[PDB]
C-alpha cells in the first residue's frame, strides 16, 4: 500500500544505578536513560 | 541558535529553564 512509514530505532539507553552508600544503605534505584517505562 | 547508532545526548543536568532560573 502506497503509505509512508517512519523508521526510528530501537529504544537504547545507558542504565544507570543510583546507589546510596553502600554502609549507609543497601537499596538500589535504576535509571534508564531517555525511555519512558511504557517500553520497558 | 539553531545520532542514533549508540550516540546518546545525556540532558544537562540544570534544564533550560532552570538554568535560566539561576
Ligand atoms: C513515553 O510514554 C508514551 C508511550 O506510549 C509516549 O507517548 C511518551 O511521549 C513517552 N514519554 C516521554 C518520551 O517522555
Known amino acids: ?40 | 541558535v539553531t545520532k542514533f547508532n549508540g550516540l546518546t545526548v545525556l540532558p544537562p543536568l540544570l534544564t533550560d529553564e532552570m538554568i535560566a532560573q539561576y
Open chain 1, 1 to 40: 500500500t502506497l503509505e509512508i512509514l517512519d523508521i526510528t530505532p530501537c529504544s537504547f539507553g545507558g542504565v544507570s544505578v543510583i546507589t546510596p552508600g553502600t554502609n549507609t544503605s543497601n537499596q538500589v534505584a535504576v535509571l534508564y536513560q531517555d525511555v519512558n517505562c511504557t517500553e520497558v
